[PDB]
Amino acid sequence: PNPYERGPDPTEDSIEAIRGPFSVATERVSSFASGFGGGTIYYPRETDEGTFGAVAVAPGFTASQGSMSWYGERVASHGFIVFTIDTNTRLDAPGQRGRQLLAALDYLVERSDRKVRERLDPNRLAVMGHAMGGGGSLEATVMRPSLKASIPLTPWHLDKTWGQVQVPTFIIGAELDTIAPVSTHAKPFYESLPSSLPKAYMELCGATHFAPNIPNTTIAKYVISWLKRFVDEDTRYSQFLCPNPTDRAICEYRSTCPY
Ligand SMILES: O=C(O)c1ccc(C(=O)OCCO)cc1
Ligand SMILES: [N+]
Incomplete structure (x- = not known):
């Protein structure tokens, strides 16, 4: 028995559903928090199954947490703590946004409310x-x-x-992305990841650069499966990740299955 498994046995319908089995409550974190510009914590209300893992979600250049808000209720309702954060300034570079993602996770572990801290497993954290x-x-x-x-x-x-990355990385690219072209960004990142790293690359057909900013079932179903498999060690979700998905919305998928 996995001590981290939460929720009933999943199906492809359950991972595609807009609402998961867990009821969600939210909390606002002030932008004057140390190391990052605040955000909103989405956490499951139910507690009798155990503490959950957490993922901090960062926005893009000049964007705020509102561009990532739909991940909140979507992912947290499946048994996760979701922290959609704002950056210190809207003009922050990727290197700064990585530090503030860690500062957001450190806030959850070290300085969060007792409603959040009691539901958090501080050893199982993720970033998006x-x-x-x-x-x-x-x-x-x-x-x-x-x-x-x-x-x-x-x-x-x-x-x-990124040949030194040791964390399971799931890269999602937009085929028609011209701001972050997959030929020069998403694909080079994935191919430079270690060949032995548990990794995957999903390219969405005809998608543009801001497709992750609106509800997307293809993004939602496999972001949930990736978090379940590696944050919860939940092998019940390996069926959705290996072998490679065959969704019509997916124009290309690469992976290092099995995990
Ligand atoms: O012009 C760029 O180099 C450049 C432009 C935009 C971005 C970006 O993060 O897009 C997401 C904003 O919602 C990154 C780099
Ligand atoms: N594909």
Whole structure:
């Protein structure tokens, strides 16, 4: 029995559903928090199944947490703590956004409310980011290799080599992305990840740079599965990740299955 498994046995319908089995409560964190510009914590109300893991979600260049708000109720209702954060300034670079993703996770572990702290397993943390926040997601794993998962969403970064990343990384790219072209960003990041790293690359057909900013079932179903598999060690979700998904919305998928 996995001590981290939460919720009933999943199906493809359950991971695609807009609402998971857990009721969600929210809390506002002031932007004057140390190390980052505040945000909103989405946590499950139910507590009788055990403490949950947490993921901090970073926005892109000049964007706020509102561009990532739909991940809050979507992911947290499946049994996770979600921290959609704002950066110190809207002009922050990927390297700075990686530091503030860690500062957001440290706030959850060290200085969070007792409603949040009681529901948090501080040993199982993850990061997720959009574009420049996706570059900061890669940065956060190099800065903290003890992280359990990492999901760069249409990532943007000047550094193309990530052969020292030790955290399971799930890169999602948009085929028609011209701001962070997958040929020069998303794919070079994935191919430079260690060949032995538990990694995956999902390219969405005909998607643009800001597709992760609105509800997307294809993004939602496999972001949930990736967090479940590596933050919860929940092998009940390995069926959705290995072998490679065959969704019509996916134009290309690469992975190092089995995990
Ligand atoms: O012009 C760029 O280099 C550049 C432009 C935009 C971004 C970015 O993070 O897009 C997401 C904003 O919501 C990254 C780099
Ligand atoms: N595919």
